Design a protein around this nucleic acid. Structure first.
Lengths: 299, 108, 299, 110, 107, 100
RNA sequence: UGAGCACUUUAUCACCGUGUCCCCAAUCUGGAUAUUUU
């Protein structure tokens, strides 16, 4: 069977994400370091919520809708997680550990087991500096209104960083009942990927992908160095040189699919040279996802 | 004992005292004059000490290098060797400075 | 539904904005850097206040008026934020977190949810040098008057920079009750956008837009590289070449709307050439906003 | 070590040179005086304060200022260490750390 | 790299040529009395310092000014001109970081 | 246990003596991950170049096989102090031991 | 290198999970006189 997995990156821009929930005077964004340098941010689970929301706006069932009425966030549910009557959030009937028992396994024969069929990892930035502020401020109303917010005035500052960052993911799934429409919708929705890290009316960021690269779609898991291309520089072109070399003389090549940035500004002669099988060269990244889904899904 | 211990303690108390006497322009003699002026002086020292305490933790490990806030708190012949001693193996110097800041923290 | 988002830039000029609130001897303007170079300034929330003020002068309700009587700034309020009786600052009934509770949710059934329906980001300059002064001075009165300001004399200097800078924004909204008049007024007011960064009687700057470009008004979110055009040079013309190419042969085009500068001084033959759909070419930027609002709003 | 004291030496030379530009180079008029010593240190502290303020403001321009602006206005001296006048092209950060340390020590105010 | 010393070495020959041009009998009269050296030292100081203002004025013409001046005095220029593509294709690295800070601010 | 297996491979095996009972270094009282071999017997032999015969008691330490080998060899003796690998070392030990 | 002097502490294996928050921009101030020879 076919297994596919890909990597993307977004355009450079300023950004900042609420990540502390620890202190009020100052905000911290830095999460994890590399080789003695702090240049990585962002959580590997917020994009799950972003995908869920986008799937909600695309007409698939609203199985789990976030509601904001209480002080602490709570999420409602339907009658019960069912991976057959509906998409079950891409068939995400998850663990229900409680002493009540009396689960559907004895009534609806539902073992409560998951159908994950998805893989994702935390993003990593490419710029190390996180020691700049903006020094905004908040006022005191004192307007004799019925509500006073803080009854004080403060001079609190925030931290932002201008960076572009990469993102790997894997699927490694297989077609089943009601899957082709749902997997096709997932591949359609991953193209946009907006509204990440909740609402942000002061900083606006997008996850529109450029230079998307997917690896080894028909073959079994053999990929390596998912975090390869970086520093606004192409790196998979030498990977094709060293892994599954284009010529079938010392290392036979493989079916690859390449994004738009790596071919928009790159040597014209190389396009003709990279024609042992022609690979898959496209101008806009969104164009190739439909064809890739058609090929991998088989229909 | 002309060692690191008193040197960092001396510069720590001198640093905090100097800039509070610059920003706020206050002396301890005026503080003891009346209980009223003392408490906001204590409160003003409260804000001064904590902002450095939190921020010095913000920059950690070798990325702190030997360049610190307000240019290493702007600290003769003993300076030459002492600078070289703190040139290498800087991890303990920053850790022990937090003790001086906690010492300068007002009681109660 | 239709979603629109655009980018603008202003004319080059000298400028300086109070941004330190830290020290008195010298003033600092530089905020954030790029690729090892410091060429970005300005906050992404002052223009919100500018829009609020301009909406005040346009006859919409004065829901939240800034008052200057106390030493620290305080802003008054009406009886309560209501997104129905009035514009609610473009329906900005925001969070009210207090222990009193007794909110209108139990009396007026108002969940205190604040509609946003707006997106904006911080501006970025295009010139890196911020190491010049003007060296003005302040006098001592000593005129035997009843008031002495400082009882001293100082020689303090200020920093200015001559630069033009770009600005992106997004709306991605939809028509609702009482919206068409309010969104039309917002689009009318964004054209002028004067009085930014508070009062400034010594440095006078304007946000009059030239070479405005809006993208993908009817289609869903697919835009990329909002910060593209810069260095007083057009860049979206090659974007049309590579994204939604003008000819419908290898990449079908899309409905775009272009500003005035990009067509005022540009090849005459290109106007005729760029006629696959004709796009939307206008001389003054203010002219096209009314038509764009009419088309997107539907009325 | 040897570079550190070299940084120390140029710090004294620059300070006295600025004093020579503003007033007399020799320092004997301010000996046991409650006013002459007061003005001598006052002009001394203000000169280093403004020079140090300019240097510490260029925080993120570490390399370039060490090529261009932090080395022209301070009159530097070279005798034989051309070989060691090379890390200024690749280090560009610790040398600044030494300079700010030397200037901070040359702040004789109580 | 190697050009750093090349610029370094050619500068002492440049200032020595400068001294030999404006002044007469060069260093042979230094052993006479320390007095005349003071005028020689102050004159050699007052010629370099005025050149500091001109050399650091503007990048474009500070090139044009220093090519003609540099071609005049030194005599080993034939070696350096035929090598490294005439200072690496005319203007590169802001004239070697402004002629290595005018030879480290004249020693 | 089979998993997490630990194996005893030779690593700088050094000791020798004339037909006299053991003494001197006592096979213990040594530091960790250092040059206990080296420091101990090099210091003893420098103190006892004439007291004990370094010709039969060959060199010590695998690290000195990488640096300062020439200096130690020239200062001590030109004996059969070869040290490249334990296998050939024990081979020449057996070669010299067949005769004795 | 001598008489009480043994022979191993031995062999195997999963924590399932899932899931992040809204709000905000201040102020004023400028300066004085002065060249001649190869």
């Amino acid at each position: 069977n076919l297994n596919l997995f890909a990597t993307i990156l977004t355009y450079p821009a300023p950004a900042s994400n609420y990540r502390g929930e620890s202190e009020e005077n100052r905000s911290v964004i830095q999460k994890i370091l590399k080789d003695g340098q702090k240049y990585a941010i962002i959580s590997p689970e917020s994009m799950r919520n972003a995908l869920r929301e986008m799937l909600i706006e695309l007409g698939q069932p609203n199985n789990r809708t976030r509601l904001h009425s209480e002080d602490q966030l709570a999420v409602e549910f339907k009658e019960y997680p069912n991976p057959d009557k509906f998409a079950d959030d891409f068939l995400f009937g998850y663990m229900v550990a409680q002493t009540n028992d009396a689960k559907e396994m004895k009534k609806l024969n539902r073992p409560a087991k998951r159908d994950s069929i998805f893989r994702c990892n935390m993003a990593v930035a490419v710029n190390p500096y996180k020691y700049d502020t903006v020094f905004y401020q908040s006022p005191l109303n004192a307007g004799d209104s019925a509500w006073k917010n803080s009854t004080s005035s403060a001079l609190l500052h925030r931290e932002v960083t201008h960076t572009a960052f990469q993102y790997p993911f894997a699927l490694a799934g297989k077609d089943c009942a009601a899957k082709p429409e749902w997997v096709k919708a997932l591949l359609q929705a991953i193209a946009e990927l907006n509204g990440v890290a909740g609402g942000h009316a002061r900083a606006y960021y997008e996850f529109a992908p450029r230079s998307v690269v997917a690896r080894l779609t028909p073959k079994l898991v053999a990929g390596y160095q998912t975090y390869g291309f970086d520093a606004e520089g192409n790196w998979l072109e030498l990977s094709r040189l060293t892994a599954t070399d284009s010529d079938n003389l010392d290392l036979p090549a493989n079916e690859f699919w390449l994004g738009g940035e790596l071919v928009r500004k790159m040597d014209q002669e190389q396009k003709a040279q990279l024609e042992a099988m022609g690979a898959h060269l496209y101008a806009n990244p969104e164009k190739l996802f439909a064809d890739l889904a058609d090929s991998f899904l088989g229909v | 004992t002309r060692e690191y211990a008193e040197i960092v303690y001396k510069i720590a108390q001198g640093f905090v005292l100097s800039k509070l006497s610059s920003k706020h322009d206050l002396q301890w003699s005026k503080c003891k004059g009346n209980p009223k002026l003392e408490r906001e002086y204590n409160d003003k020292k409260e804000k001064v000490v904590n902002e450095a305490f939190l921020a010095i933790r913000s920059r950690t490990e070798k990325q702190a290098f030997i360049d610190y806030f307000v240019s290493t708190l702007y600290p003769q012949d003993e300076f030459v060797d002492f600078a070289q001693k703190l040139f290498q193996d800087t991890d303990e110097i920053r850790s022990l400075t937090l003790l001086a800041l906690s010492s300068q923290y007002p009681i109660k």
